[PDB]
Amino acid sequence: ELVNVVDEKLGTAYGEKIDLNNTNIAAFIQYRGLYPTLAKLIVKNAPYESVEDVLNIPGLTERQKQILRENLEHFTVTEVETALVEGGDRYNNGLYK
Amino acid sequence: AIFRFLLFFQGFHNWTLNPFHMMGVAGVLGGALLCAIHGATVENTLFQDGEGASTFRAFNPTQAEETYSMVTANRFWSQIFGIAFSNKRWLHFFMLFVPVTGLWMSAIGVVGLALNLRSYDFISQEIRAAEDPEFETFYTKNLLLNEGIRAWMAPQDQPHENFVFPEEVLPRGNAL
Amino acid sequence: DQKLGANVGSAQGPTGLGKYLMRSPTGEIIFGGETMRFWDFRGPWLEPLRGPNGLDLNKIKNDIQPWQERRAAEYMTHAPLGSLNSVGGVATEINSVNFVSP
Amino acid sequence: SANLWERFCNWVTSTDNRLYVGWFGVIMIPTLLAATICFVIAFIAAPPVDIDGIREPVSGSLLYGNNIITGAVVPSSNAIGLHFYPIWEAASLDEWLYNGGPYQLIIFHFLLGASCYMGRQWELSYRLGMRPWICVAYSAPLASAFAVFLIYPIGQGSFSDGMPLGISGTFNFMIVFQAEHNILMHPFHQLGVAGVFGGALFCAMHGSLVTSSLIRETTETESANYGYKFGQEEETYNIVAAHGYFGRLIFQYASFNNSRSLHFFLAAWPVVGVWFTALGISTMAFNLNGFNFNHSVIDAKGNVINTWADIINRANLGMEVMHERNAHNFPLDLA
Amino acid sequence: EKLAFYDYIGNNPAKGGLFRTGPMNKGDGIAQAWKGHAVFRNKEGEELFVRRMPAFFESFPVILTDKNGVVKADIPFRRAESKYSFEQQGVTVSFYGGELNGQTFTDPPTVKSYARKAIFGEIFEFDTETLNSDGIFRTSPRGWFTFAHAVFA
Amino acid sequence: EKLAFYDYIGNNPAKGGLFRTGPMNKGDGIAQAWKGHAVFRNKEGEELFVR
Amino acid sequence: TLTYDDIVGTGLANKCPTLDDTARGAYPIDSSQTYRIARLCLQPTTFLVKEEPKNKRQEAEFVPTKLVTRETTSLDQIQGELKVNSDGSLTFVEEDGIDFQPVTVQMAGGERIPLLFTVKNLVASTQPNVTSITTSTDFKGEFNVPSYRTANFLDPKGRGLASGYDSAIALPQAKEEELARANVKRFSLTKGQISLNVAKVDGRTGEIAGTFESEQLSDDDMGAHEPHEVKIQGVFYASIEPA
Amino acid sequence: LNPMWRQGMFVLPFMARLGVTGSWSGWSITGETGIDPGFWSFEGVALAHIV
Amino acid sequence: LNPMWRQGMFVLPFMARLGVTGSWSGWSITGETGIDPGFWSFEGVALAHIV
Amino acid sequence: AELTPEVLTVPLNSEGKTITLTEKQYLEGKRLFQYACASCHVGGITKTNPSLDLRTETLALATPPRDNIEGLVDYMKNPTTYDGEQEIAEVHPSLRSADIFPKMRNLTEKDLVAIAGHILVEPKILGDKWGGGKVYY
Numbered sequence A: 001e002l003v004n005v006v007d008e009k010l011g012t013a014y015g016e017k018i019d020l021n022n023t024n025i026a027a028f029i030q031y032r033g034l035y036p037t038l039a040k041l042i043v044k045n046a047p048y049e050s051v052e053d054v055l056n057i058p059g060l061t062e063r064q065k066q067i068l069r070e071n072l073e074h075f076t077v078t079e080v081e082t083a084l085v086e087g088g089d090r091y092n093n094g095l096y097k
Numbered sequence B: 001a002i003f004r005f006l007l008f009f010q011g012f013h014n015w016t017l018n019p020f021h022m023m024g025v026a027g028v029l030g031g032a033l034l035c036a037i038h039g040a041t042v043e044n045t046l047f048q049d050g051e052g053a054s055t056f057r058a059f060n061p062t063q064a065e066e067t068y069s070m071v072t073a074n075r076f077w078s079q080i081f082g083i084a085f086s087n088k089r090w091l092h093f094f095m096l097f098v099p100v101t102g103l104w105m106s107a108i109g110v111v112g113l114a115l116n117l118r119s120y121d122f123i124s125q126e127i128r129a130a131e132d133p134e135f136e137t138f139y140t141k142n143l144l145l146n147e148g149i150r151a152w153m154a155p156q157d158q159p160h161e162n163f164v165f166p167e168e169v170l171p172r173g174n175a176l
Numbered sequence C: 001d002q003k004l005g006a007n008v009g010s011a012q013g014p015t016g017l018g019k020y021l022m023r024s025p026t027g028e029i030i031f032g033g034e035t036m037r038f039w040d041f042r043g044p045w046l047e048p049l050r051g052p053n054g055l056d057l058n059k060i061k062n063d064i065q066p067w068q069e070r071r072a073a074e075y076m077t078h079a080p081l082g083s084l085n086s087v088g089g090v091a092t093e094i095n096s097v098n099f100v101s102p
Numbered sequence D: 001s002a003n004l005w006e007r008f009c010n011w012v013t014s015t016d017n018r019l020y021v022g023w024f025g026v027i028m029i030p031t032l033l034a035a036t037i038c039f040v041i042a043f044i045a046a047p048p049v050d051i052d053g054i055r056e057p058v059s060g061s062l063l064y065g066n067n068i069i070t071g072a073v074v075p076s077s078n079a080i081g082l083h084f085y086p087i088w089e090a091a092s093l094d095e096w097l098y099n100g101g102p103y104q105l106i107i108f109h110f111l112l113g114a115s116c117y118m119g120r121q122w123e124l125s126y127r128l129g130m131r132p133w134i135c136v137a138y139s140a141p142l143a144s145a146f147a148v149f150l151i152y153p154i155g156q157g158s159f160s161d162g163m164p165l166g167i168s169g170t171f172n173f174m175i176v177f178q179a180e181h182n183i184l185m186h187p188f189h190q191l192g193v194a195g196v197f198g199g200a201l202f203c204a205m206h207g208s209l210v211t212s213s214l215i216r217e218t219t220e221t222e223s224a225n226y227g228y229k230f231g232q233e234e235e236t237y238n239i240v241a242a243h244g245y246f247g248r249l250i251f252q253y254a255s256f257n258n259s260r261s262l263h264f265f266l267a268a269w270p271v272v273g274v275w276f277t278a279l280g281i282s283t284m285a286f287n288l289n290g291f292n293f294n295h296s297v298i299d300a301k302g303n304v305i306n307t308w309a310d311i312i313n314r315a316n317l318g319m320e321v322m323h324e325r326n327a328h329n330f331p332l333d334l335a
Numbered sequence E: 001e002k003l004a005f006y007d008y009i010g011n012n013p014a015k016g017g018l019f020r021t022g023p024m025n026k027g028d029g030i031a032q033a034w035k036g037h038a039v040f041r042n043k044e045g046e047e048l049f050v051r052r053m054p055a056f057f058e059s060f061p062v063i064l065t066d067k068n069g070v071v072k073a074d075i076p077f078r079r080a081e082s083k084y085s086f087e088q089q090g091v092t093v094s095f096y097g098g099e100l101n102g103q104t105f106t107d108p109p110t111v112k113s114y115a116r117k118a119i120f121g122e123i124f125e126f127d128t129e130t131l132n133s134d135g136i137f138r139t140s141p142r143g144w145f146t147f148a149h150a151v152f153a
Numbered sequence F: 001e002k003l004a005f006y007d008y009i010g011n012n013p014a015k016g017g018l019f020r021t022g023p024m025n026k027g028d029g030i031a032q033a034w035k036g037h038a039v040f041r042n043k044e045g046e047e048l049f050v051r
Numbered sequence G: 001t002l003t004y005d006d007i008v009g010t011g012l013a014n015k016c017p018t019l020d021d022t023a024r025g026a027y028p029i030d031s032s033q034t035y036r037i038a039r040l041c042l043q044p045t046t047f048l049v050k051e052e053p054k055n056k057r058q059e060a061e062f063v064p065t066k067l068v069t070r071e072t073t074s075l076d077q078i079q080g081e082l083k084v085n086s087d088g089s090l091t092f093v094e095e096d097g098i099d100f101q102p103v104t105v106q107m108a109g110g111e112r113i114p115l116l117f118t119v120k121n122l123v124a125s126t127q128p129n130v131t132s133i134t135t136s137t138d139f140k141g142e143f144n145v146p147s148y149r150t151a152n153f154l155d156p157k158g159r160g161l162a163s164g165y166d167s168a169i170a171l172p173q174a175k176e177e178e179l180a181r182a183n184v185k186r187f188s189l190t191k192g193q194i195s196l197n198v199a200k201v202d203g204r205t206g207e208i209a210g211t212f213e214s215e216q217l218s219d220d221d222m223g224a225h226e227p228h229e230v231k232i233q234g235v236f237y238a239s240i241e242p243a
Numbered sequence H, I: 001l002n003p004m005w006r007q008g009m010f011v012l013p014f015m016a017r018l019g020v021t022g023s024w025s026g027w028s029i030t031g032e033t034g035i036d037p038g039f040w041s042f043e044g045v046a047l048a049h050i051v
Numbered sequence J: 001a002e003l004t005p006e007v008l009t010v011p012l013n014s015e016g017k018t019i020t021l022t023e024k025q026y027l028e029g030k031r032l033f034q035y036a037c038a039s040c041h042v043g044g045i046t047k048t049n050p051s052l053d054l055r056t057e058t059l060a061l062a063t064p065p066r067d068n069i070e071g072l073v074d075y076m077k078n079p080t081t082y083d084g085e086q087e088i089a090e091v092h093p094s095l096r097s098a099d100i101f102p103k104m105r106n107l108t109e110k111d112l113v114a115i116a117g118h119i120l121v122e123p124k125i126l127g128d129k130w131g132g133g134k135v136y137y
């Protein structure tokens, strides 16, 4: 049947925590020291099979890995949704103030 | 406080799309034309009754001859517009009729807006717009403008309703 | 956004036209958005990014200079939009920045 | 033959023509026939136009689902901007109708002809020995069409931003304009409605005063109009009885007794008022908008105390935030 | 049922249009039965309330608040940052008395459908077939008589 | 298909009525496709023909 | 070489570079030295739209169409590695570039057929054992065709997928089952086929040229109607370099 | 659920406000049966005026 | 299966009998594409007479 | 309903210590805020990057914390990204870059304290308005 994949996504982990595989980059601005450098790395570094897989990003300094560990409770992960990832919408989804 | 009355009527009643309002403007706009056109037609079809350039003094406050060539005026317009008056009595009655009839029509339209019996939509249009997502007219466009007006104004324009419209419920295009 | 890791060259906007870069009617690579109407603009700050076919995706990708970024920022926040009473911005803006382009 | 060309010039300029095809007419008559014929065909059978250059065609013709009130001739694409788009600039007509080609062909020919129409309104006045200036009254409505069809587009950087050729299409032009420029709060527009309201007012004033002070020459059961013959020597109304009444309505010195001073005012008012309204659209075409009193009156602590000026801003944001849904990609609307 | 029926905006003479001809039935359709009172609740069991449609509005948004008027749930426009979507709140709907009496619905779409309906007051079951209705409100005789005479006068 | 179509009485001009207005399509409907030749047979295998 | 001004308004900018009749040589592949494509470019020449055989399945063919938009069709600035494979073949793998252009073409009836002509995520391959790239050294592979309109796009009535209205707000009390398809927006994602067959090599500077043929689906308009099959023929130009 | 004011009735209500609430065919505005409106039924009123 | 004579066309056939078999929009009576009818297309004929 | 010194009491440093501004400093800040910020920071937002605003909470979760006089002042001298892992004085007005941003030349330590104070006092007065954009206008 016909369903709005996005409105359905909001009934899962996404919609409750920062989805490492879908959620737009700006969402990382709600936690200390994640935005610029790390959010870019997280988003840029394709999907993850589990939240912890973020700790495995090649190059992460020991401090970055520390920070990531702290905020894991604010992340989750769900199937990559095209409607939410296509068009590069994770770097700019047409929303501002 | 009157400009919002205008904007309101657009947003809520889609007043501009009302047949009576249109007649209204047709009368006021058309009435402001007769005013201008007749005035100019007279000042530039005047007879010479003085030796000065400022022909204002050259006027006979005590009737007698016509101060402007009604016969010349007729021929002028009859050649530039194709149609032209030729009975000052009618030309002047016309000038009463046009703007007075206009305002009367614009009134009726509002008398209907009282009961909210507006001229908001065209049903045939909405039905096709529902089934077919690629059908777009300057009409559909306008209705969306109304939606925005209502949603963004209603809160501070109707305090007694204690409206609270979460940012996420607020209709908005892209980027803006 | 490019600094945030976005590939400007292949970015697809809502209409499917090209969020950041698109083509003009005669084939040249220009900026996207409503700004497609001003693809005839030439200027010191922007020229070094233009190639023989219009905006070069390689220069744009790594030759943007800081003086240009702040130039763009400066001019962006100083567009010739204002009110009679001299309130810079869009008719819906708030009072604060008293300015109207010469 | 007294000399063909010499004759030609005598015919053209002839004041014995049913319609005075003038010298200006020689340019007018063809340009206006192109504009009208193209319009009528467009409005009836033209296909959808991608006005906003974002590949989202807006159909505005009858045969494509429109009626008189909604239907319109859609402005050229925004991808075209201010570029000249003549039929011979398109790979095919199919491409030309899609990019809103007809619009330019229409606006350019009309504005051209409508100008010559003014030039003619002088010429005939010359050939007939009457004073000029009538054409100067017509300079106001023309200067508006110009402002709405050419000045605003030049200023805004695209013809896609010019007023559409249709009823609803015009309402769109207004609603959006207001949002981006807050025109109701601009002096020039206010003077415009003053001229228009005033016009209609005075038009009713004169009209009534005169018709009400007509010298009786008609039966009780005979049209009061017949009491006038085309080509009269004396006047058909008592301008002294007229002034007598109106002078008592308000007060003597606030009433006209000089038909010439009356008629000048009658013409001067609307034309001057509309001149400013035309200058309004032409001024706001360079983003010098109406007064912005947003968050002006604030209280002792700093809180913002709203005025009707603010309630207007909300209504404006709605229009702003909703117009051209998919056309914006960035924060500020600078186009 | 009769009593519930009067509590439906589709009988408010202030809804309608000048050229929206015919009976009120060519609009929402011939009323068949009262589906019942709809009570909306969210995961915590809290009972929500649907903000009704003021006659002024042709279209109105779906917003849900508690007794104190605090917005608890709604149907978002831009989902990008929605905090109260029916999904995130586990909103459900239950009916009492009427067609849907004793039943409950929990799948977001169905819940939102009825929520979208609650806005007009008591939810009813219409027969749109017969008169080939279009689903656009029309005014009552009270409304027409009032308009005609206000004009004539 | 075209050839088969001509062998259909619904294209015979002698069928119709004086006040049966409109195109032939308002009648039997817009032709979409040829279902095919129908061959009728009875228990004995004999082939029958429709008058 | 020509400057920007030497091309502006001529339409030349929407034209992939060309090699002269001479350049019909062959470029060598070290197989122990990584190679990449500094610039792949695709220029459309024709857009054919396979017609729906009506109900009467009679086998359908592709038909030419008029380009209703203008000279904005070309794909340029494509880039990626041209890794050499064990069996001695070559596979190109795109990374980034102007890899898509929204094209709209009309047909016999007058129907506009919009498509998102692209080659996103290209993975072209060649014949096994290809020490040197000769004339006609077929490249074949698939790519991805994302929805024409992205998530944020709103239809004339405000309805959208990632944003916009939930239903037909213009018909407050209408049955919804019929309107289902047009209210619920779906984001289509599909595969495409393309083949780049060389025609001109130039081992000297390492820049090959040729012609391509690709097939893909057109816009389904947020899943409101079925997509049309499209075939696209044109020419290409690639700049191979060691790097 | 389907009273006169839902069926775009305009004259029928003014006839009930003063007494006429039945039809010669048996039914009645209030919804009763077996009632005998006599001659002054909606039909009756309508008849009268025509004459 | 759906030629002019099924669509209640009356003038369209008389225009094909003498040559005009195409439209400025691209299609053609015989069912071909890419054809260029020139000016004398059904539209053309229709245009001419009006003038 | 007035700007009491109770409202002009904003956090001075990270260690809880506070400072109390005066109606003179406030107005002065407000004036300076217009002179060198409004251009891009009108009403607490950020035109050239709408993702980061001047909301006290936003400044609180910044890195280092910029939700106090000390914080904001440092920033106005040597600006950094939200995680602080990168100095941006080259594309953001600051003291160490007044040659590039002339408006910042006049600005003296007195001025910097006022501007900083303004940023912390505004939300106290306007509330939600200060952070959000057109939605709250």
Ligand code: CLA
Pocket (backbone or CB within 6 Å): B005, B006, B007, B009, B010, B015, B016, B021, B024, B025, B026, B028, B029, B102, B103, B106, B107, B108, B110, D174, D196, D197
């Ligand atoms: C082409 C553009 C156009 C035009 C020509 C008109 C024209 C008109 N509109 Mg209109 N309108 C437009 C666009 C336009 N509109 C748009 C875009 C909108 C937004 C949707 C509206 C919304 C709108 C509304 C909501 C209304 C109109 C109305 C009217 C009409 C009545 C105006 C009148 O004469 O007041 C005359 C004012 C009076 C009330 C007359 C009595 C006033 C006394 C005599 C004056 C006393 C003065 C005093 C002595 C001096 C003291 C003052 C002191 C300050 C000195 C008029 C026909 C109104 C109408 O239709 O009402 C019937 C109306 O309600 N319009």
Ligand code: CLA
Pocket (backbone or CB within 6 Å): B002, B005, B006, D189, D190, D191, D193, D194, D195, D197, D198, D201
């Ligand atoms: C209550 C009736 C009323 C009145 C008094 C006004 C009055 C006015 N409207 Mg207005 N308006 C009304 C209803 C009314 N409106 C309605 C119902 C609508 C539609 C919703 C509008 C829509 C509207 C618009 C859109 C605009 C106005 C504007 C104006 C102002 C200039 C209009 C003008 O030039 O008229 C033309 C008529 C004249 C030429 C008569 C002039 C008479 C004036 C009032 C002076 C009177 C003299 C004064 C009494 C002093 C005499 C004392 C002396 C003898 C000692 C004016 C103050 C304009 C404005 O805002 O400008 C600032 C404007 O843009 N109105």
Ligand code: CLA
Pocket (backbone or CB within 6 Å): B101, B105, E018, E019, E021, E022, E023, E140, E141, E144, E145, E148, E149, H007, H008, H009, H010
């Ligand atoms: C004024 C008294 C009146 C009233 C209040 C009603 C009311 C009603 N009638 Mg009705 N009717 C009336 C008189 C009246 N009728 C008369 C005299 C007749 C005999 C012709 C009918 C015949 C009739 C029928 C046959 C039907 C109704 C129906 C209905 C109902 C549906 C409403 C409707 O269709 O609106 C329609 C309203 C309009 C379209 C508005 C008309 C406004 C016009 C267009 C304005 C014209 C402007 C003018 C040209 C401008 C020029 C002026 C300029 C030159 C200066 C409604 C209760 C229907 C019903 O049965 O419902 C089930 C129905 O089927 N009526």
Ligand code: CLA
Pocket (backbone or CB within 6 Å): F018, F019, F020, F021, F022, F023, I007, I008, I009, I010
């Ligand atoms: C005689 C030439 C002629 C012919 C052969 C046709 C034939 C046709 N037309 Mg047609 N048409 C014609 C002239 C003609 N038209 C003209 C002049 C017009 C302009 C008004 C039209 C306008 C027109 C339209 C708009 C349409 C057609 C259509 C059609 C087709 C459908 C057939 C039809 O509807 O039958 C209808 C036949 C009748 C109802 C018979 C009328 C007989 C009357 C009732 C007799 C009157 C008797 C008289 C009063 C007695 C008084 C005498 C007594 C006092 C002594 C058909 C091919 C339709 C088509 O397009 O199909 C898809 C269609 O939509 N035509």
Ligand SMILES: CC(C)=CCC/C(C)=C/CC/C(C)=C/CC/C(C)=C/CC/C(C)=C/CC/C(C)=C/CC/C(C)=C/CC/C(C)=C/CC/C(C)=C/CC1=CC(=O)C(C)=C(C)C1=O
Pocket (backbone or CB within 6 Å): B022, B023, B024, B026, B027, B030, B031, B033, B034, B037, B038, B039, B041, B042, B070, B073, B074, B077, B081, B083, B084, B085, B086, B091, B097, B098, B099, B101, B102, B105, D040, D043, D044, D068, D166, D167
């Ligand atoms: C292909 C298709 C279908 C095309 C469609 C195109 C399109 C969309 C068109 C739609 C048009 C449309 C339907 C518009 C609706 C508007 C309309 C009909 C409104 C309703 C009108 C109405 C009943 C309302 C009442 C208000 C009213 C009475 C206004 C009337 C205004 C009116 C007619 C004024 C006429 C003004 C005018 C130009 C007259 C000039 C007269 C003249 C030449 C005088 C010159 C002159 C001056 C002198 O001084 C002297 C001395 C002489 C001698 C003299 O001559």
Ligand SMILES: CCCCCCCCCCCCCCCC(=O)OC[C@H](CO[C@@H]1O[C@H](CS(=O)(=O)O)[C@@H](O)[C@H](O)[C@H]1O)OC(=O)CCCCCCCCCCCCCCC
Pocket (backbone or CB within 6 Å): D011, D017, D018, D019, D020, D021, D028, D029, D032, D033, D036
């Ligand atoms: C690409 C180029 C195309 C060129 C086209 C070919 C040339 C033009 C052919 C014209 C054929 C049509 C004849 C028209 C007759 C006529 O108008 O009246 C006949 C009168 C009498 O003419 C008088 O007529 C006299 C002859 S007679 O009286 O007609 O017998 C004659 O002797 C005298 O010279 C003459 O002035 O014509 C005139 O008074 C001259 C003015 C003609 C004005 C032309 C139309 C103006 C249109 C303005 C724009 C309107 C826009 C659309 C609005 C709907």
Ligand SMILES: [Ca+2]
Pocket (backbone or CB within 6 Å): G051, G052, G111
């Ligand atoms: Ca097809």
Ligand SMILES: [Cl-]
Pocket (backbone or CB within 6 Å): B141, B142, D172, D176, D322, D323, D324, D325
């Ligand atoms: Cl719009």
